[PDB]
Amino acid sequence: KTEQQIADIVNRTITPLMQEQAIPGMAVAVIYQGKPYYFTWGKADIANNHPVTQQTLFELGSVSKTFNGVLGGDAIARGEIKLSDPVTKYWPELTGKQWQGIRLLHLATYTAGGLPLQIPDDVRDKAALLHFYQNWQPQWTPGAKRLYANSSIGLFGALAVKPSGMSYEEAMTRRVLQPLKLAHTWITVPQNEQKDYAWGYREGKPVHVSPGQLDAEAYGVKSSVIDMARWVQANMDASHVQEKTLQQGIALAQSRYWRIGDMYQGLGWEMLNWPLKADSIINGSDSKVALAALPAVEVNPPAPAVKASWVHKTGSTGGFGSYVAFVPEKNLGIVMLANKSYPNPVRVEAAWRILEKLQ
């Protein structure tokens, strides 16, 4: 396929998507036979008429969890943690019986027993966060059910970097971002990059994600389409990542720790066997399913990364909707960055219709 053919497929899918969803600005990168092709439409800033560029920073939302999973897998490869470790090894103040059987594994894969989707917004400092976790009561035994939750994987990332002696952001920067040359990826956007920081739009107003407890670990990364293009290719094939633990941690985040219907829980990343029916991905992304508490079947030992997988993650904030998906077997992938939130089933639809024509 040529650049012309890729562009044609991309634009034929993106332009009506942006019209129907009323998305002001969009950036998309296609990974075709291992190489990136970039596309940009619309405005990053409506009132000030700043266009979207290949330097535009987008709020990744819960795609931030894939960096978490990779940073965590890095910590595993460095021997700093093991997912079988108890949470109290890393936060000993969580005394109290409900935390006794909970391991880093459960926090990482949302199987702790019902940690809630959001950390409550009235939990705004260190004292209240500890009190929140100390006093949370589970609905199931550890590892019974998967319930997707910021408070779960968010805490895993905050604890997994404790051996390193570094904060989450500094560990992330030093161990993942700088080694992969992601120089336009931020947990906090410095002042000299604010001009490239797109505005999300929620009900026609410009907005940026609000500070929250453990936001960095769960939904507070911002990145450009080129950095996310590099992200996808590094996770799809890290054979040329020169840091041995990072290349190993990339792979462990794609190990299959749990099977939940036809999907498998990695570390941040989620996987389905490839090839597959599109309705599986599309229907699975409806929040009626993805936010549901489902029975979790442990894969023990975790199955190593399967190259015939559809590997993906949705991510949203109040004003942004992102999606990343790739298929290692084909060296084929996509990233879709939008400064308006729109339905996950619609993101998956557009991704699949682009990637199905590039097989």
Side-chain angles (χ1 to χ4, degrees), residues 234-249:
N235 283 269
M236 176 141 64
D237 161 28
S239 55
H240 306 285
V241 171
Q242 290 303 110
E243 298 74 359
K244 166 82 160 282
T245 59
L246 180 55
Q247 157 192 77
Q248 260 158 352

PDB file of all heavy atoms in Angstrom, residues 234-249:
ATOM      1  N   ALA A 234       7.192   0.860  19.656  1.00  0.00           N
ATOM      2  CA  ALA A 234       7.978   0.256  20.730  1.00  0.00           C
ATOM      3  C   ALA A 234       7.228  -0.906  21.387  1.00  0.00           C
ATOM      4  O   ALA A 234       7.805  -1.969  21.629  1.00  0.00           O
ATOM      5  CB  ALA A 234       8.362   1.319  21.760  1.00  0.00           C
ATOM      6  N   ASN A 235       5.936  -0.739  21.666  1.00  0.00           N
ATOM      7  CA  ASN A 235       5.207  -1.848  22.279  1.00  0.00           C
ATOM      8  C   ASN A 235       4.937  -2.973  21.286  1.00  0.00           C
ATOM      9  O   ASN A 235       4.884  -4.143  21.675  1.00  0.00           O
ATOM     10  CB  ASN A 235       3.899  -1.346  22.891  1.00  0.00           C
ATOM     11  CG  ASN A 235       4.125  -0.634  24.212  1.00  0.00           C
ATOM     12  OD1 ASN A 235       4.093  -1.253  25.275  1.00  0.00           O
ATOM     13  ND2 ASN A 235       4.374   0.664  24.149  1.00  0.00           N
ATOM     14  N   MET A 236       4.739  -2.640  20.013  1.00  0.00           N
ATOM     15  CA  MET A 236       4.509  -3.675  19.016  1.00  0.00           C
ATOM     16  C   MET A 236       5.750  -4.529  18.790  1.00  0.00           C
ATOM     17  O   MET A 236       5.637  -5.733  18.540  1.00  0.00           O
ATOM     18  CB  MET A 236       4.068  -3.038  17.697  1.00  0.00           C
ATOM     19  CG  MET A 236       3.898  -4.016  16.559  1.00  0.00           C
ATOM     20  SD  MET A 236       2.448  -3.580  15.575  1.00  0.00           S
ATOM     21  CE  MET A 236       2.961  -1.982  14.957  1.00  0.00           C
ATOM     22  N   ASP A 237       6.936  -3.932  18.882  1.00  0.00           N
ATOM     23  CA  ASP A 237       8.172  -4.646  18.565  1.00  0.00           C
ATOM     24  C   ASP A 237       9.319  -3.868  19.213  1.00  0.00           C
ATOM     25  O   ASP A 237       9.789  -2.880  18.650  1.00  0.00           O
ATOM     26  CB  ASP A 237       8.319  -4.743  17.058  1.00  0.00           C
ATOM     27  CG  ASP A 237       9.736  -5.042  16.605  1.00  0.00           C
ATOM     28  OD1 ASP A 237      10.506  -5.670  17.355  1.00  0.00           O
ATOM     29  OD2 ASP A 237      10.060  -4.641  15.454  1.00  0.00           O
ATOM     30  N   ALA A 238       9.731  -4.295  20.399  1.00  0.00           N
ATOM     31  CA  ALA A 238      10.806  -3.640  21.133  1.00  0.00           C
ATOM     32  C   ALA A 238      12.150  -4.319  20.918  1.00  0.00           C
ATOM     33  O   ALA A 238      13.030  -4.240  21.782  1.00  0.00           O
ATOM     34  CB  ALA A 238      10.462  -3.594  22.621  1.00  0.00           C
ATOM     35  N   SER A 239      12.305  -5.033  19.797  1.00  0.00           N
ATOM     36  CA  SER A 239      13.543  -5.758  19.509  1.00  0.00           C
ATOM     37  C   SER A 239      14.741  -4.824  19.381  1.00  0.00           C
ATOM     38  O   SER A 239      15.888  -5.285  19.453  1.00  0.00           O
ATOM     39  CB  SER A 239      13.394  -6.595  18.231  1.00  0.00           C
ATOM     40  OG  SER A 239      12.981  -5.795  17.140  1.00  0.00           O
ATOM     41  N   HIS A 240      14.511  -3.522  19.203  1.00  0.00           N
ATOM     42  CA  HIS A 240      15.587  -2.549  19.060  1.00  0.00           C
ATOM     43  C   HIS A 240      15.621  -1.562  20.217  1.00  0.00           C
ATOM     44  O   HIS A 240      16.395  -0.596  20.181  1.00  0.00           O
ATOM     45  CB  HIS A 240      15.457  -1.813  17.720  1.00  0.00           C
ATOM     46  CG  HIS A 240      15.393  -2.731  16.538  1.00  0.00           C
ATOM     47  ND1 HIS A 240      16.500  -3.392  16.046  1.00  0.00           N
ATOM     48  CD2 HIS A 240      14.351  -3.111  15.760  1.00  0.00           C
ATOM     49  CE1 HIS A 240      16.142  -4.134  15.012  1.00  0.00           C
ATOM     50  NE2 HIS A 240      14.844  -3.981  14.818  1.00  0.00           N
ATOM     51  N   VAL A 241      14.803  -1.781  21.241  1.00  0.00           N
ATOM     52  CA  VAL A 241      14.963  -1.058  22.495  1.00  0.00           C
ATOM     53  C   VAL A 241      16.220  -1.570  23.181  1.00  0.00           C
ATOM     54  O   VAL A 241      16.330  -2.760  23.505  1.00  0.00           O
ATOM     55  CB  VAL A 241      13.725  -1.224  23.383  1.00  0.00           C
ATOM     56  CG1 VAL A 241      13.986  -0.662  24.776  1.00  0.00           C
ATOM     57  CG2 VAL A 241      12.553  -0.530  22.739  1.00  0.00           C
ATOM     58  N   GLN A 242      17.180  -0.676  23.400  1.00  0.00           N
ATOM     59  CA  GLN A 242      18.491  -1.118  23.838  1.00  0.00           C
ATOM     60  C   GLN A 242      18.571  -1.337  25.342  1.00  0.00           C
ATOM     61  O   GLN A 242      19.441  -2.087  25.795  1.00  0.00           O
ATOM     62  CB  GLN A 242      19.547  -0.114  23.375  1.00  0.00           C
ATOM     63  CG  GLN A 242      19.750  -0.134  21.856  1.00  0.00           C
ATOM     64  CD  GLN A 242      20.147  -1.516  21.330  1.00  0.00           C
ATOM     65  OE1 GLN A 242      19.369  -2.187  20.642  1.00  0.00           O
ATOM     66  NE2 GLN A 242      21.365  -1.944  21.656  1.00  0.00           N
ATOM     67  N   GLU A 243      17.689  -0.723  26.125  1.00  0.00           N
ATOM     68  CA  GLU A 243      17.670  -0.969  27.562  1.00  0.00           C
ATOM     69  C   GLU A 243      16.973  -2.305  27.812  1.00  0.00           C
ATOM     70  O   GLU A 243      15.792  -2.463  27.490  1.00  0.00           O
ATOM     71  CB  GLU A 243      16.974   0.178  28.294  1.00  0.00           C
ATOM     72  CG  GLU A 243      17.649   1.547  28.142  1.00  0.00           C
ATOM     73  CD  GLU A 243      17.451   2.187  26.752  1.00  0.00           C
ATOM     74  OE1 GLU A 243      16.795   1.557  25.883  1.00  0.00           O
ATOM     75  OE2 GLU A 243      17.960   3.314  26.525  1.00  0.00           O
ATOM     76  N   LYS A 244      17.708  -3.268  28.373  1.00  0.00           N
ATOM     77  CA  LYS A 244      17.219  -4.646  28.425  1.00  0.00           C
ATOM     78  C   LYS A 244      15.977  -4.768  29.300  1.00  0.00           C
ATOM     79  O   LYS A 244      15.043  -5.520  28.977  1.00  0.00           O
ATOM     80  CB  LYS A 244      18.327  -5.566  28.936  1.00  0.00           C
ATOM     81  CG  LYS A 244      17.857  -6.965  29.350  1.00  0.00           C
ATOM     82  CD  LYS A 244      17.711  -7.904  28.161  1.00  0.00           C
ATOM     83  CE  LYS A 244      17.728  -9.380  28.579  1.00  0.00           C
ATOM     84  NZ  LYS A 244      19.102  -9.891  28.872  1.00  0.00           N
ATOM     85  N   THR A 245      15.943  -4.043  30.418  1.00  0.00           N
ATOM     86  CA  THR A 245      14.804  -4.174  31.319  1.00  0.00           C
ATOM     87  C   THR A 245      13.561  -3.531  30.724  1.00  0.00           C
ATOM     88  O   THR A 245      12.448  -4.009  30.958  1.00  0.00           O
ATOM     89  CB  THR A 245      15.135  -3.551  32.668  1.00  0.00           C
ATOM     90  OG1 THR A 245      15.468  -2.171  32.475  1.00  0.00           O
ATOM     91  CG2 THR A 245      16.317  -4.277  33.287  1.00  0.00           C
ATOM     92  N   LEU A 246      13.734  -2.449  29.962  1.00  0.00           N
ATOM     93  CA  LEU A 246      12.601  -1.784  29.330  1.00  0.00           C
ATOM     94  C   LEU A 246      11.998  -2.656  28.235  1.00  0.00           C
ATOM     95  O   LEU A 246      10.775  -2.811  28.144  1.00  0.00           O
ATOM     96  CB  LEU A 246      13.041  -0.436  28.759  1.00  0.00           C
ATOM     97  CG  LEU A 246      11.914   0.327  28.071  1.00  0.00           C
ATOM     98  CD1 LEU A 246      10.744   0.483  29.025  1.00  0.00           C
ATOM     99  CD2 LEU A 246      12.391   1.679  27.564  1.00  0.00           C
ATOM    100  N   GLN A 247      12.850  -3.224  27.387  1.00  0.00           N
ATOM    101  CA  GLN A 247      12.375  -4.162  26.381  1.00  0.00           C
ATOM    102  C   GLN A 247      11.668  -5.344  27.028  1.00  0.00           C
ATOM    103  O   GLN A 247      10.672  -5.852  26.496  1.00  0.00           O
ATOM    104  CB  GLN A 247      13.559  -4.613  25.533  1.00  0.00           C
ATOM    105  CG  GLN A 247      13.406  -5.940  24.830  1.00  0.00           C
ATOM    106  CD  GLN A 247      14.731  -6.428  24.249  1.00  0.00           C
ATOM    107  OE1 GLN A 247      15.593  -6.934  24.972  1.00  0.00           O
ATOM    108  NE2 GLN A 247      14.904  -6.253  22.942  1.00  0.00           N
ATOM    109  N   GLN A 248      12.168  -5.795  28.180  1.00  0.00           N
ATOM    110  CA  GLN A 248      11.510  -6.881  28.902  1.00  0.00           C
ATOM    111  C   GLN A 248      10.197  -6.422  29.531  1.00  0.00           C
ATOM    112  O   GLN A 248       9.202  -7.159  29.519  1.00  0.00           O
ATOM    113  CB  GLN A 248      12.452  -7.442  29.974  1.00  0.00           C
ATOM    114  CG  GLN A 248      13.144  -8.745  29.549  1.00  0.00           C
ATOM    115  CD  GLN A 248      14.415  -9.029  30.322  1.00  0.00           C
ATOM    116  OE1 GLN A 248      14.891  -8.195  31.100  1.00  0.00           O
ATOM    117  NE2 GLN A 248      14.976 -10.218  30.111  1.00  0.00           N
ATOM    118  N   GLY A 249      10.180  -5.212  30.094  1.00  0.00           N
ATOM    119  CA  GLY A 249       8.962  -4.712  30.708  1.00  0.00           C
ATOM    120  C   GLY A 249       7.881  -4.411  29.691  1.00  0.00           C
ATOM    121  O   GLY A 249       6.693  -4.601  29.962  1.00  0.00           O
TER     122      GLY A 249
END
